[PDB]
Amino acid sequence: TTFVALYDYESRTETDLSFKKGERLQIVNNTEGDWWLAHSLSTGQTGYIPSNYVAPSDSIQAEEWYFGKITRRESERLLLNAENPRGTFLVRESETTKGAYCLSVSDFDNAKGLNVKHYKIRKLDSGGFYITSRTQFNSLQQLVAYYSKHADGLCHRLTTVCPTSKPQTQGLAKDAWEIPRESLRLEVKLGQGCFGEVWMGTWNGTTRVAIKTLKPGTMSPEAFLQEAQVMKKLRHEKLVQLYAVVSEEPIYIVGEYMSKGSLLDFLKGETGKYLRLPQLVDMAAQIASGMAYVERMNYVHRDLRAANILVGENLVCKVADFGLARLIEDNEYTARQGAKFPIKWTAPEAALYGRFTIKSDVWSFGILLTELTTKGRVPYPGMVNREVLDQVERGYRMPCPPECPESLHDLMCQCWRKEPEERPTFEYLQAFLEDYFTSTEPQYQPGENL
Numbered sequence: 306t307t308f309v310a311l312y313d314y315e316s317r318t319e320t321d322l323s324f325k326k327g328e329r330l331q332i333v334n335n336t337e338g339d340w341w342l343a344h345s346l347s348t349g350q351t352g353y354i355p356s357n358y359v360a361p362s363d364s365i366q367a368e369e370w371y372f373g374k375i376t377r378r379e380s381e382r383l384l385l386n387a388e389n390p391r392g393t394f395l396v397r398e399s400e401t402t403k404g405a406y407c408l409s410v411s412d413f414d415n416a417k418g419l420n421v422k423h424y425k426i427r428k429l430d431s432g433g434f435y436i437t438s439r440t441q442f443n444s445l446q447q448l449v450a451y452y453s454k455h456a457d458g459l460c461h462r463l464t465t466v467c468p469t470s471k472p473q474t475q476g477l478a479k480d481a482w483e484i485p486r487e488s489l490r491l492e493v494k495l496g497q498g499c500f501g502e503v504w505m506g507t508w509n510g511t512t513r514v515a516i517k518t519l520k521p522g523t524m525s526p527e528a529f530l531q532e533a534q535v536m537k538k539l540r541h542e543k544l545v546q547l548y549a550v551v552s553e554e555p556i557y558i559v560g561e562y563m564s565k566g567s568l569l570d571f572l573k574g575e576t577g578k579y580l581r582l583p584q585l586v587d588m589a590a591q592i593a594s595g596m597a598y599v600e601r602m603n604y605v606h607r608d609l610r611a612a613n614i615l616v617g618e619n620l621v622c623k624v625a626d627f628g629l630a631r632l633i634e635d636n637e638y639t640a641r642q643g644a645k646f647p648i649k650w651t652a653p654e655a656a657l658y659g660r661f662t663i664k665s666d667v668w669s670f671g672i673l674l675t676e677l678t679t680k681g682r683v684p685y686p687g688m689v690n691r692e693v694l695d696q697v698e699r700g701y702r703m704p705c706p707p708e709c710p711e712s713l714h715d716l717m718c719q720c721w722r723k724e725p726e727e728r729p730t731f732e733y734l735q736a737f738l739e740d741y742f743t744s745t746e747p748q749y750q751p752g753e754n755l
């Protein structure tokens with residue numbers, strides 16, 4: 306019945322409970338969602354703890370080299386990290402077959418370079434596990450530990466577990482949502498948006514958080530609080546998580562600190578100098594993927610653009626500032642006008658009829674796509690805002706960009722089809738981008754290579 310600490314965890318409040326990886330915890334009250342009241346067996350202290358920080362004793366989730374339900378694409382992301390010596394591996398669930406697992410390993414080919422081989426693990430009726438018929442085990446752990454000593458036909462011996470970062474605790478603490486202003490100390494100014502400022506800071510003198518400040522009058526607090534309610538329900542691997550908020554003006558928005566900055570910025574300068582088509586595409590698919598969930602959630606971003614796409618380690622992309630624009634009270638902006646409204650990204654029907662839907666966002670993504678293929682080049686190069694709606698209204702569209710493959714320009718076009726619902730879905734854009742270069746995310750090794 307005991308739980309085991311997958312990671313360490315510092316005490317943030319007067320009411321939570323610190324611990325070390327490996328530390329056993331009695332889950333003495335599971336009657337919550339993201340924070341469990343627990344009691345430490347070693348120390349014996351009692352307090353709240355972040356659920357995604359533990360797993361059951363003897364469970365598979367207890368295993369540090371088990372990644373759960375991650376996509377092959379994602380793990381490959383992780384594994385391919387340069388610092389990872391050959392043989393860095395992980396064990397996740399196969400998506401192709403329900404129940405089966407997959408052992409992914411980094412390898413190096415003198416003639417192919419670094420890469421990751423995948424080996425499906427089949428579990429027999431018996432209950433056995435095995436990659437190859439001539440060697441099965443009773444637990445993934447016996448399998449793993451085995452290949453940890455002997456390669457045995459695998460592309461290489463499983464040297465090192467795949468290193469990952471402490472994950473995000475949903476929220477700063479239990480019930481924590483509308484936190485006192487004084488609990489945030491703004492440290493570093495990170496950017497100056499049109500309606501506010503964004504700072505790297507600390508909540509309760511322990512946590513690394515990102516805070517957004519909004520100039521007063523910007524938006525109705527009550528409305529904000531209401532919208533925040535909705536936002537707060539959107540959890541996605543490719544969406545910048547929301548943590549807590551300061552409702553009274555100057556309203557504050559406290560979320561995940563993304564080191565690598567805005568994808569726009571990053572796209573230009575040296576950061577995006579050795580950026581190749583294959584990497585750009587990936588960023589796009591990550592974005593699609595995020596937008597895909599907004600779509601399934603039946604939500605609307607209303608301000609999608611490179612500038613609202615943040616970067617993370619391993620070239621990870623997360624969508625930000627979703628919603629907020631719909632709360633902007635600035636007159637001109639409400640009328641989709643003025644020097645502060647991102648018109649060049651706005652779908653016509655949205656500029657003209659304020660009809661903001663997912664389909665308008667698909668338009669936006671289209672533009673964003675060109676940003677990707679042109680190192681953050683402001684779109685509609687030869688047009689000042691004022692004449693853009695006009696032009697696009699009449700059917701004008703940015704031609705295929707320099708060095709952008711036509712297929713991507715055609716994607717773009719599909720995103721700009723005058724008819725909102727002729728424009729493709731994110732679920733689609735996600736699939737399309739996810740397999741450009743003859744790689745449908747399939748192909749696992751056979752068995753004994755030797």
Ligand SMILES: O=P(O)(O)OP(=O)(O)OC[C@H]1O[C@@H](n2cnc3c(NCc4ccccc4)ncnc32)[C@H](O)[C@@H]1O
Nearest residue numbers: 496498499503515516517558560561562563566567612
């Ligand atoms: O809308 P624009 O003007 O592009 O500018 P902002 O609304 O400030 O957002 C993007 C700019 O601010 C910085 N920035 C924004 N967010 C972050 C961030 N974490 C996400 C987050 C922060 C605050 C509240 C919830 C989530 N980590 C690091 N830098 C960030 C960027 O460098 C960019 O210049």
